[PDB]
C-alpha atoms as an extended CHARMM CRD file, in Angstrom:
* protein
*
        10  EXT
         1         1  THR       CA             23.4340000000       38.3680000000       -5.9130000000  PROA      1               0.0000000000
         2         2  UNK       CA             21.4370000000       36.7250000000       -8.0620000000  PROA      2               0.0000000000
         3         3  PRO       CA             22.0740000000       33.4270000000       -8.3760000000  PROA      3               0.0000000000
         4         4  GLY       CA             25.0100000000       34.3530000000       -9.1000000000  PROA      4               0.0000000000
         5         5  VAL       CA             27.4090000000       37.2240000000       -8.6830000000  PROA      5               0.0000000000
         6         6  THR       CA             19.9960000000       36.0390000000       -5.1220000000  PROA      6               0.0000000000
         7         7  UNK       CA             19.5810000000       39.5820000000       -5.7780000000  PROA      7               0.0000000000
         8         8  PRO       CA             20.1910000000       41.5130000000       -4.1430000000  PROA      8               0.0000000000
         9         9  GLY       CA             18.4300000000       40.6120000000       -1.9300000000  PROA      9               0.0000000000
        10        10  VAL       CA             16.5670000000       37.8760000000       -2.2350000000  PROA      10              0.0000000000
């Protein structure tokens, strides 16, 4: 995720 907690996605 995120970053943080990429995206999703990417």
